[PDB]
Amino acid sequence: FMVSLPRMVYPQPKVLTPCRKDVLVVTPWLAPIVWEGTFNIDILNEQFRLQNTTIGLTVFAIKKYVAFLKLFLETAEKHFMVGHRVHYYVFTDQPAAVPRVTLGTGRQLSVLEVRMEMISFCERRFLSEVDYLVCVDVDMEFRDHVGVEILTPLFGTLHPSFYGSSREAFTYERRPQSQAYIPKDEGDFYYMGAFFGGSVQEVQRLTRACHQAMMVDQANGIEAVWHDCSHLNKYLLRHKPTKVLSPEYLWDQQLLGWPAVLRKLRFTAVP
């Protein structure tokens, strides 16, 4: 049950004026593609706060990757779901190397000592603790707002190197013997494994499926070309995401600059 929104004053949406004319803003299966200018964050914040939404954010930081935690978490504090309940889950082989980062109210951090497998021993915990799970790479920093506009049952993010490419150029797994196989004439988008998420139930479904597919490939003596990313793309081909995030949400400014089509650079690679 969802209670009523309060009175709000904002500009009237214009039926005969698109928010963006330069980019595709809805997939052919009617999932929004999230770009700056497509959303009123005030409306969305109200909607999600009225449900007391809790968002879990998972990151793996193994060996030398623990070095990236401090910037990742400090910048997540400035930009990630601010105003909402957040639970960080940091999976690491070095609990003592996790930096003590100061968190805003309603935000917590758990250190889990030790990717698809692990997400699908944590199953009951996540179901009890959060509403949505967001899974990201740690060698990244937030540079702008990443908020409730991404939340939906299942989302993927456009790979920043491939959003303009034809599907034949996508580096999907192309060996027919692999569970991740995608033929040259199939594929909607090339999603990147560095940022995906959804409800806890859908993320566990995805991670369970990818783990089973990886196990099958292993038993058959084959390893998919981009490992996690190949399997993620196969899953998202066959189970269409309910939102797709634009490359604003997964960028590398050193490699790719700041093109006009990106009004904001929200979450970026660290050199």
PDB file of C-alpha atoms in Angstrom:
ATOM      1  CA  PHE A   1       0.000   0.000   0.000  1.00  0.00           C
ATOM      2  CA  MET A   2       1.337   3.398  -1.142  1.00  0.00           C
ATOM      3  CA  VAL A   3       0.048   6.559   0.593  1.00  0.00           C
ATOM      4  CA  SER A   4      -0.714   9.792  -1.270  1.00  0.00           C
ATOM      5  CA  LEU A   5       1.976  12.200  -2.376  1.00  0.00           C
ATOM      6  CA  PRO A   6       1.778  15.651  -0.860  1.00  0.00           C
ATOM      7  CA  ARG A   7       1.016  18.751  -2.896  1.00  0.00           C
ATOM      8  CA  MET A   8       4.049  19.636  -4.977  1.00  0.00           C
ATOM      9  CA  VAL A   9       4.831  22.559  -7.288  1.00  0.00           C
ATOM     10  CA  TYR A  10       6.881  21.779 -10.377  1.00  0.00           C
ATOM     11  CA  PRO A  11       6.863  22.516 -14.118  1.00  0.00           C
ATOM     12  CA  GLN A  12       4.107  20.803 -16.090  1.00  0.00           C
ATOM     13  CA  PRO A  13       5.360  18.003 -18.324  1.00  0.00           C
ATOM     14  CA  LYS A  14       4.719  18.879 -21.964  1.00  0.00           C
ATOM     15  CA  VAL A  15       3.270  16.016 -24.015  1.00  0.00           C
ATOM     16  CA  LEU A  16       4.490  17.514 -27.341  1.00  0.00           C
ATOM     17  CA  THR A  17       7.926  18.413 -25.948  1.00  0.00           C
ATOM     18  CA  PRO A  18      10.375  15.506 -25.283  1.00  0.00           C
ATOM     19  CA  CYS A  19      12.767  15.829 -22.287  1.00  0.00           C
ATOM     20  CA  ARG A  20      15.636  14.634 -24.495  1.00  0.00           C
ATOM     21  CA  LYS A  21      15.623  14.437 -28.358  1.00  0.00           C
ATOM     22  CA  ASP A  22      19.261  13.341 -28.738  1.00  0.00           C
ATOM     23  CA  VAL A  23      19.010   9.940 -27.032  1.00  0.00           C
ATOM     24  CA  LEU A  24      16.720   6.935 -26.636  1.00  0.00           C
ATOM     25  CA  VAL A  25      14.876   7.309 -23.299  1.00  0.00           C
ATOM     26  CA  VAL A  26      12.748   4.119 -23.333  1.00  0.00           C
ATOM     27  CA  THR A  27      13.644   0.608 -24.520  1.00  0.00           C
ATOM     28  CA  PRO A  28      11.452  -1.387 -26.910  1.00  0.00           C
ATOM     29  CA  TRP A  29      10.144  -3.335 -23.922  1.00  0.00           C
ATOM     30  CA  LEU A  30       9.070  -0.052 -22.295  1.00  0.00           C
ATOM     31  CA  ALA A  31      11.852   0.213 -19.691  1.00  0.00           C
ATOM     32  CA  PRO A  32      13.042   3.758 -19.047  1.00  0.00           C
ATOM     33  CA  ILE A  33      16.609   4.584 -19.971  1.00  0.00           C
ATOM     34  CA  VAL A  34      17.802   6.942 -17.263  1.00  0.00           C
ATOM     35  CA  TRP A  35      19.403  10.156 -18.487  1.00  0.00           C
ATOM     36  CA  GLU A  36      19.637  13.596 -16.940  1.00  0.00           C
ATOM     37  CA  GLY A  37      16.504  15.576 -17.850  1.00  0.00           C
ATOM     38  CA  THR A  38      14.213  12.512 -17.909  1.00  0.00           C
ATOM     39  CA  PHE A  39      13.327  12.562 -14.154  1.00  0.00           C
ATOM     40  CA  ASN A  40      12.093  14.929 -11.488  1.00  0.00           C
ATOM     41  CA  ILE A  41      14.085  13.728  -8.508  1.00  0.00           C
ATOM     42  CA  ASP A  42      11.763  15.474  -6.080  1.00  0.00           C
ATOM     43  CA  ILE A  43       8.831  13.320  -7.168  1.00  0.00           C
ATOM     44  CA  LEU A  44      10.920  10.134  -7.058  1.00  0.00           C
ATOM     45  CA  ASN A  45      12.418  10.979  -3.657  1.00  0.00           C
ATOM     46  CA  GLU A  46       8.920  11.431  -2.225  1.00  0.00           C
ATOM     47  CA  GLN A  47       7.758   8.167  -3.706  1.00  0.00           C
ATOM     48  CA  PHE A  48      10.689   6.167  -2.315  1.00  0.00           C
ATOM     49  CA  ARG A  49      10.867   7.892   1.096  1.00  0.00           C
ATOM     50  CA  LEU A  50       7.172   7.186   1.598  1.00  0.00           C
ATOM     51  CA  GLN A  51       8.080   3.474   1.356  1.00  0.00           C
ATOM     52  CA  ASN A  52      11.040   3.885   3.799  1.00  0.00           C
ATOM     53  CA  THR A  53      13.286   2.389   1.146  1.00  0.00           C
ATOM     54  CA  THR A  54      16.579   0.836   2.212  1.00  0.00           C
ATOM     55  CA  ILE A  55      19.280   0.397  -0.386  1.00  0.00           C
ATOM     56  CA  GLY A  56      22.134  -2.098  -0.030  1.00  0.00           C
ATOM     57  CA  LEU A  57      25.400  -1.349  -1.856  1.00  0.00           C
ATOM     58  CA  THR A  58      27.807  -4.244  -2.347  1.00  0.00           C
ATOM     59  CA  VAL A  59      31.504  -3.942  -3.172  1.00  0.00           C
ATOM     60  CA  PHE A  60      34.327  -6.446  -3.267  1.00  0.00           C
ATOM     61  CA  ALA A  61      37.710  -5.277  -2.201  1.00  0.00           C
ATOM     62  CA  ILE A  62      40.273  -8.051  -2.372  1.00  0.00           C
ATOM     63  CA  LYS A  63      44.063  -7.773  -2.141  1.00  0.00           C
ATOM     64  CA  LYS A  64      45.308  -4.382  -3.424  1.00  0.00           C
ATOM     65  CA  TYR A  65      41.732  -3.201  -4.192  1.00  0.00           C
ATOM     66  CA  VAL A  66      41.270  -2.293  -0.526  1.00  0.00           C
ATOM     67  CA  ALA A  67      43.183   0.872  -1.427  1.00  0.00           C
ATOM     68  CA  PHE A  68      40.117   2.157  -3.365  1.00  0.00           C
ATOM     69  CA  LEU A  69      37.677   1.922  -0.433  1.00  0.00           C
ATOM     70  CA  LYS A  70      38.319   5.276   1.180  1.00  0.00           C
ATOM     71  CA  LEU A  71      37.519   7.365  -1.937  1.00  0.00           C
ATOM     72  CA  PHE A  72      34.688   5.047  -2.972  1.00  0.00           C
ATOM     73  CA  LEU A  73      32.899   5.327   0.392  1.00  0.00           C
ATOM     74  CA  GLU A  74      33.639   9.047   1.029  1.00  0.00           C
ATOM     75  CA  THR A  75      32.215   9.946  -2.404  1.00  0.00           C
ATOM     76  CA  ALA A  76      29.252   7.537  -1.952  1.00  0.00           C
ATOM     77  CA  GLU A  77      28.473   9.542   1.194  1.00  0.00           C
ATOM     78  CA  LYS A  78      28.217  12.734  -0.863  1.00  0.00           C
ATOM     79  CA  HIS A  79      26.313  11.349  -3.841  1.00  0.00           C
ATOM     80  CA  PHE A  80      24.690   7.953  -3.330  1.00  0.00           C
ATOM     81  CA  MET A  81      21.052   7.819  -2.176  1.00  0.00           C
ATOM     82  CA  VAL A  82      21.527  10.771   0.185  1.00  0.00           C
ATOM     83  CA  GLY A  83      18.385  11.106   2.332  1.00  0.00           C
ATOM     84  CA  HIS A  84      17.592   7.428   2.112  1.00  0.00           C
ATOM     85  CA  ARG A  85      18.583   4.441   4.259  1.00  0.00           C
ATOM     86  CA  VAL A  86      21.816   2.870   2.980  1.00  0.00           C
ATOM     87  CA  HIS A  87      23.592  -0.307   4.023  1.00  0.00           C
ATOM     88  CA  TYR A  88      27.092  -0.815   2.607  1.00  0.00           C
ATOM     89  CA  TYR A  89      28.353  -4.415   2.409  1.00  0.00           C
ATOM     90  CA  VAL A  90      32.079  -4.550   1.974  1.00  0.00           C
ATOM     91  CA  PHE A  91      33.391  -8.026   1.090  1.00  0.00           C
ATOM     92  CA  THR A  92      37.122  -8.241   1.742  1.00  0.00           C
ATOM     93  CA  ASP A  93      40.030 -10.554   2.658  1.00  0.00           C
ATOM     94  CA  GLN A  94      41.433  -7.755   4.868  1.00  0.00           C
ATOM     95  CA  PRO A  95      38.837  -6.525   7.401  1.00  0.00           C
ATOM     96  CA  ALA A  96      41.531  -4.420   9.093  1.00  0.00           C
ATOM     97  CA  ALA A  97      42.387  -2.494   5.886  1.00  0.00           C
ATOM     98  CA  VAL A  98      38.779  -1.208   5.572  1.00  0.00           C
ATOM     99  CA  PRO A  99      39.059   2.594   6.238  1.00  0.00           C
ATOM    100  CA  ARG A 100      36.984   4.135   9.020  1.00  0.00           C
ATOM    101  CA  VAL A 101      34.783   6.435   6.937  1.00  0.00           C
ATOM    102  CA  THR A 102      32.344   8.765   8.631  1.00  0.00           C
ATOM    103  CA  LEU A 103      28.740   8.008   7.616  1.00  0.00           C
ATOM    104  CA  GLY A 104      25.646  10.201   7.549  1.00  0.00           C
ATOM    105  CA  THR A 105      22.663   9.388   9.662  1.00  0.00           C
ATOM    106  CA  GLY A 106      20.635   6.327   8.561  1.00  0.00           C
ATOM    107  CA  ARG A 107      23.639   4.817   6.795  1.00  0.00           C
ATOM    108  CA  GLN A 108      25.588   1.773   7.956  1.00  0.00           C
ATOM    109  CA  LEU A 109      28.503  -0.331   6.884  1.00  0.00           C
ATOM    110  CA  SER A 110      29.108  -4.069   7.366  1.00  0.00           C
ATOM    111  CA  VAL A 111      32.441  -5.771   6.715  1.00  0.00           C
ATOM    112  CA  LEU A 112      32.096  -9.317   5.379  1.00  0.00           C
ATOM    113  CA  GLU A 113      35.202 -11.377   5.418  1.00  0.00           C
ATOM    114  CA  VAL A 114      35.927 -13.689   2.498  1.00  0.00           C
ATOM    115  CA  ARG A 115      31.170 -12.453  -6.610  1.00  0.00           C
ATOM    116  CA  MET A 116      28.008 -14.048  -8.102  1.00  0.00           C
ATOM    117  CA  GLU A 117      28.278 -16.981  -5.643  1.00  0.00           C
ATOM    118  CA  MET A 118      28.705 -14.735  -2.587  1.00  0.00           C
ATOM    119  CA  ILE A 119      25.784 -12.450  -3.485  1.00  0.00           C
ATOM    120  CA  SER A 120      23.415 -15.429  -4.053  1.00  0.00           C
ATOM    121  CA  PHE A 121      25.684 -17.162   1.684  1.00  0.00           C
ATOM    122  CA  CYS A 122      24.162 -13.651   2.026  1.00  0.00           C
ATOM    123  CA  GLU A 123      20.661 -14.430   0.786  1.00  0.00           C
ATOM    124  CA  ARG A 124      18.581 -14.331   3.979  1.00  0.00           C
ATOM    125  CA  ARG A 125      20.542 -11.403   5.356  1.00  0.00           C
ATOM    126  CA  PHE A 126      19.907  -9.152   2.350  1.00  0.00           C
ATOM    127  CA  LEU A 127      16.227 -10.101   2.263  1.00  0.00           C
ATOM    128  CA  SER A 128      15.861  -9.097   5.880  1.00  0.00           C
ATOM    129  CA  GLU A 129      17.947  -5.901   5.722  1.00  0.00           C
ATOM    130  CA  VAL A 130      17.401  -4.059   2.440  1.00  0.00           C
ATOM    131  CA  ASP A 131      14.768  -3.516  -0.274  1.00  0.00           C
ATOM    132  CA  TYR A 132      17.138  -3.089  -3.232  1.00  0.00           C
ATOM    133  CA  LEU A 133      20.660  -4.312  -3.885  1.00  0.00           C
ATOM    134  CA  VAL A 134      23.164  -2.384  -5.983  1.00  0.00           C
ATOM    135  CA  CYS A 135      26.326  -4.182  -7.039  1.00  0.00           C
ATOM    136  CA  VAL A 136      29.332  -2.102  -8.123  1.00  0.00           C
ATOM    137  CA  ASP A 137      33.084  -2.175  -8.639  1.00  0.00           C
ATOM    138  CA  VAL A 138      35.226  -0.537  -5.954  1.00  0.00           C
ATOM    139  CA  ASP A 139      37.879   1.160  -8.206  1.00  0.00           C
ATOM    140  CA  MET A 140      35.412   3.960  -8.850  1.00  0.00           C
ATOM    141  CA  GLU A 141      34.266   7.278  -7.390  1.00  0.00           C
ATOM    142  CA  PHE A 142      30.980   9.099  -7.313  1.00  0.00           C
ATOM    143  CA  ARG A 143      31.151  12.580  -8.806  1.00  0.00           C
ATOM    144  CA  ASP A 144      27.441  13.473  -9.031  1.00  0.00           C
ATOM    145  CA  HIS A 145      24.004  12.382  -7.887  1.00  0.00           C
ATOM    146  CA  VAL A 146      23.164   8.643  -8.041  1.00  0.00           C
ATOM    147  CA  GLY A 147      19.783   8.233  -6.493  1.00  0.00           C
ATOM    148  CA  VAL A 148      16.407   6.583  -6.396  1.00  0.00           C
ATOM    149  CA  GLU A 149      15.838   7.145 -10.128  1.00  0.00           C
ATOM    150  CA  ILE A 150      17.836   3.925 -10.678  1.00  0.00           C
ATOM    151  CA  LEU A 151      15.613   1.780  -8.439  1.00  0.00           C
ATOM    152  CA  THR A 152      13.430  -0.826 -10.117  1.00  0.00           C
ATOM    153  CA  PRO A 153      13.104  -4.625 -10.003  1.00  0.00           C
ATOM    154  CA  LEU A 154      16.115  -5.186 -12.270  1.00  0.00           C
ATOM    155  CA  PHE A 155      18.577  -2.765 -13.889  1.00  0.00           C
ATOM    156  CA  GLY A 156      21.707  -2.876 -15.975  1.00  0.00           C
ATOM    157  CA  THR A 157      24.056  -0.106 -17.092  1.00  0.00           C
ATOM    158  CA  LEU A 158      25.288   0.616 -20.603  1.00  0.00           C
ATOM    159  CA  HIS A 159      28.972  -0.137 -21.088  1.00  0.00           C
ATOM    160  CA  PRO A 160      30.566   3.257 -21.779  1.00  0.00           C
ATOM    161  CA  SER A 161      32.782   1.998 -24.598  1.00  0.00           C
ATOM    162  CA  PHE A 162      29.913   0.406 -26.533  1.00  0.00           C
ATOM    163  CA  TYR A 163      26.729   2.523 -26.222  1.00  0.00           C
ATOM    164  CA  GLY A 164      27.166   3.770 -29.818  1.00  0.00           C
ATOM    165  CA  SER A 165      28.200   0.390 -31.282  1.00  0.00           C
ATOM    166  CA  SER A 166      26.362  -2.043 -33.506  1.00  0.00           C
ATOM    167  CA  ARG A 167      25.518  -5.325 -31.783  1.00  0.00           C
ATOM    168  CA  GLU A 168      27.926  -7.295 -33.987  1.00  0.00           C
ATOM    169  CA  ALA A 169      30.794  -5.239 -32.425  1.00  0.00           C
ATOM    170  CA  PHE A 170      29.698  -6.037 -28.872  1.00  0.00           C
ATOM    171  CA  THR A 171      32.191  -8.312 -27.131  1.00  0.00           C
ATOM    172  CA  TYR A 172      29.572 -10.857 -26.066  1.00  0.00           C
ATOM    173  CA  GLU A 173      30.632 -14.485 -25.715  1.00  0.00           C
ATOM    174  CA  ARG A 174      30.523 -15.822 -29.316  1.00  0.00           C
ATOM    175  CA  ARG A 175      31.410 -19.520 -28.792  1.00  0.00           C
ATOM    176  CA  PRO A 176      28.269 -21.702 -29.146  1.00  0.00           C
ATOM    177  CA  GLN A 177      29.608 -24.096 -26.488  1.00  0.00           C
ATOM    178  CA  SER A 178      29.309 -21.454 -23.763  1.00  0.00           C
ATOM    179  CA  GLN A 179      26.154 -20.887 -21.716  1.00  0.00           C
ATOM    180  CA  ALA A 180      26.822 -17.161 -22.250  1.00  0.00           C
ATOM    181  CA  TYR A 181      26.717 -17.520 -26.061  1.00  0.00           C
ATOM    182  CA  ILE A 182      24.923 -14.720 -27.948  1.00  0.00           C
ATOM    183  CA  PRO A 183      24.682 -14.960 -31.765  1.00  0.00           C
ATOM    184  CA  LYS A 184      25.647 -12.041 -33.995  1.00  0.00           C
ATOM    185  CA  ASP A 185      22.021 -11.172 -34.809  1.00  0.00           C
ATOM    186  CA  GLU A 186      20.891 -10.978 -31.134  1.00  0.00           C
ATOM    187  CA  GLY A 187      21.405  -8.427 -28.395  1.00  0.00           C
ATOM    188  CA  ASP A 188      19.789  -5.196 -27.248  1.00  0.00           C
ATOM    189  CA  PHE A 189      22.644  -3.482 -25.443  1.00  0.00           C
ATOM    190  CA  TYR A 190      26.084  -4.214 -24.063  1.00  0.00           C
ATOM    191  CA  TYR A 191      25.779  -3.908 -20.319  1.00  0.00           C
ATOM    192  CA  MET A 192      28.792  -3.637 -18.002  1.00  0.00           C
ATOM    193  CA  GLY A 193      29.182  -5.783 -14.898  1.00  0.00           C
ATOM    194  CA  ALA A 194      30.484  -2.843 -12.823  1.00  0.00           C
ATOM    195  CA  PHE A 195      27.016  -1.521 -11.961  1.00  0.00           C
ATOM    196  CA  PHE A 196      23.847  -3.596 -11.820  1.00  0.00           C
ATOM    197  CA  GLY A 197      21.064  -4.054  -9.282  1.00  0.00           C
ATOM    198  CA  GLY A 198      17.385  -4.357  -8.548  1.00  0.00           C
ATOM    199  CA  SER A 199      15.173  -5.768  -5.819  1.00  0.00           C
ATOM    200  CA  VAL A 200      16.889  -8.292  -3.583  1.00  0.00           C
ATOM    201  CA  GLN A 201      14.799 -11.111  -5.138  1.00  0.00           C
ATOM    202  CA  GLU A 202      15.768 -10.188  -8.721  1.00  0.00           C
ATOM    203  CA  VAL A 203      19.430  -9.676  -7.908  1.00  0.00           C
ATOM    204  CA  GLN A 204      19.535 -13.101  -6.196  1.00  0.00           C
ATOM    205  CA  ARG A 205      17.836 -14.600  -9.290  1.00  0.00           C
ATOM    206  CA  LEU A 206      20.361 -13.040 -11.571  1.00  0.00           C
ATOM    207  CA  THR A 207      23.359 -14.017  -9.426  1.00  0.00           C
ATOM    208  CA  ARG A 208      22.016 -17.597  -8.979  1.00  0.00           C
ATOM    209  CA  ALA A 209      21.565 -17.968 -12.753  1.00  0.00           C
ATOM    210  CA  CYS A 210      24.972 -16.529 -13.605  1.00  0.00           C
ATOM    211  CA  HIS A 211      26.662 -18.793 -11.009  1.00  0.00           C
ATOM    212  CA  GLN A 212      24.929 -21.909 -12.429  1.00  0.00           C
ATOM    213  CA  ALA A 213      25.902 -20.920 -16.012  1.00  0.00           C
ATOM    214  CA  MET A 214      29.542 -20.358 -14.957  1.00  0.00           C
ATOM    215  CA  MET A 215      29.555 -23.774 -13.265  1.00  0.00           C
ATOM    216  CA  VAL A 216      28.255 -25.412 -16.437  1.00  0.00           C
ATOM    217  CA  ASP A 217      30.905 -23.719 -18.597  1.00  0.00           C
ATOM    218  CA  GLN A 218      33.620 -24.796 -16.115  1.00  0.00           C
ATOM    219  CA  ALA A 219      32.399 -28.425 -16.186  1.00  0.00           C
ATOM    220  CA  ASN A 220      32.627 -28.238 -20.024  1.00  0.00           C
ATOM    221  CA  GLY A 221      36.184 -26.854 -19.989  1.00  0.00           C
ATOM    222  CA  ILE A 222      35.323 -23.374 -21.310  1.00  0.00           C
ATOM    223  CA  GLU A 223      35.784 -19.875 -19.801  1.00  0.00           C
ATOM    224  CA  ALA A 224      33.658 -16.989 -21.197  1.00  0.00           C
ATOM    225  CA  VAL A 225      35.635 -14.151 -22.818  1.00  0.00           C
ATOM    226  CA  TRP A 226      34.739 -11.481 -20.195  1.00  0.00           C
ATOM    227  CA  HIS A 227      33.819 -13.859 -17.334  1.00  0.00           C
ATOM    228  CA  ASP A 228      31.065 -12.217 -15.187  1.00  0.00           C
ATOM    229  CA  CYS A 229      30.214  -9.670 -17.939  1.00  0.00           C
ATOM    230  CA  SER A 230      29.462 -12.299 -20.616  1.00  0.00           C
ATOM    231  CA  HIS A 231      27.033 -14.125 -18.336  1.00  0.00           C
ATOM    232  CA  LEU A 232      25.434 -10.902 -17.147  1.00  0.00           C
ATOM    233  CA  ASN A 233      24.772  -9.922 -20.785  1.00  0.00           C
ATOM    234  CA  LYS A 234      23.234 -13.300 -21.561  1.00  0.00           C
ATOM    235  CA  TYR A 235      20.958 -13.049 -18.548  1.00  0.00           C
ATOM    236  CA  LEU A 236      19.889  -9.485 -19.404  1.00  0.00           C
ATOM    237  CA  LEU A 237      19.173 -10.485 -22.998  1.00  0.00           C
ATOM    238  CA  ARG A 238      16.842 -13.232 -21.818  1.00  0.00           C
ATOM    239  CA  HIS A 239      15.353 -11.390 -18.792  1.00  0.00           C
ATOM    240  CA  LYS A 240      14.928  -7.796 -19.852  1.00  0.00           C
ATOM    241  CA  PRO A 241      15.799  -5.153 -17.274  1.00  0.00           C
ATOM    242  CA  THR A 242      13.020  -2.914 -16.048  1.00  0.00           C
ATOM    243  CA  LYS A 243      15.338   0.160 -16.238  1.00  0.00           C
ATOM    244  CA  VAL A 244      18.595   0.722 -18.112  1.00  0.00           C
ATOM    245  CA  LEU A 245      21.062   3.293 -16.804  1.00  0.00           C
ATOM    246  CA  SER A 246      22.779   5.595 -19.300  1.00  0.00           C
ATOM    247  CA  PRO A 247      26.602   5.905 -19.378  1.00  0.00           C
ATOM    248  CA  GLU A 248      26.291   8.849 -16.999  1.00  0.00           C
ATOM    249  CA  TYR A 249      26.202   6.087 -14.400  1.00  0.00           C
ATOM    250  CA  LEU A 250      29.404   4.256 -15.486  1.00  0.00           C
ATOM    251  CA  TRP A 251      32.065   6.435 -17.152  1.00  0.00           C
ATOM    252  CA  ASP A 252      35.820   6.770 -17.605  1.00  0.00           C
ATOM    253  CA  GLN A 253      36.718  10.381 -18.247  1.00  0.00           C
ATOM    254  CA  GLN A 254      40.405   9.649 -18.913  1.00  0.00           C
ATOM    255  CA  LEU A 255      39.535   7.123 -21.649  1.00  0.00           C
ATOM    256  CA  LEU A 256      36.372   8.740 -23.021  1.00  0.00           C
ATOM    257  CA  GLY A 257      36.313  12.436 -22.157  1.00  0.00           C
ATOM    258  CA  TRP A 258      33.069  14.322 -21.517  1.00  0.00           C
ATOM    259  CA  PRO A 259      30.878  14.214 -24.583  1.00  0.00           C
ATOM    260  CA  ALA A 260      27.868  16.524 -25.100  1.00  0.00           C
ATOM    261  CA  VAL A 261      25.382  13.673 -24.709  1.00  0.00           C
ATOM    262  CA  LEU A 262      26.513  13.314 -21.068  1.00  0.00           C
ATOM    263  CA  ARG A 263      25.102  16.174 -19.057  1.00  0.00           C
ATOM    264  CA  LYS A 264      26.492  14.711 -15.843  1.00  0.00           C
ATOM    265  CA  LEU A 265      29.295  12.257 -15.084  1.00  0.00           C
ATOM    266  CA  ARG A 266      28.008  10.486 -11.962  1.00  0.00           C
ATOM    267  CA  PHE A 267      30.158   7.415 -11.220  1.00  0.00           C
ATOM    268  CA  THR A 268      33.559   7.105 -12.805  1.00  0.00           C
ATOM    269  CA  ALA A 269      36.690   5.033 -13.009  1.00  0.00           C
ATOM    270  CA  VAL A 270      39.622   5.973 -10.828  1.00  0.00           C
ATOM    271  CA  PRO A 271      42.944   6.245 -12.800  1.00  0.00           C
TER     272      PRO A 271
END
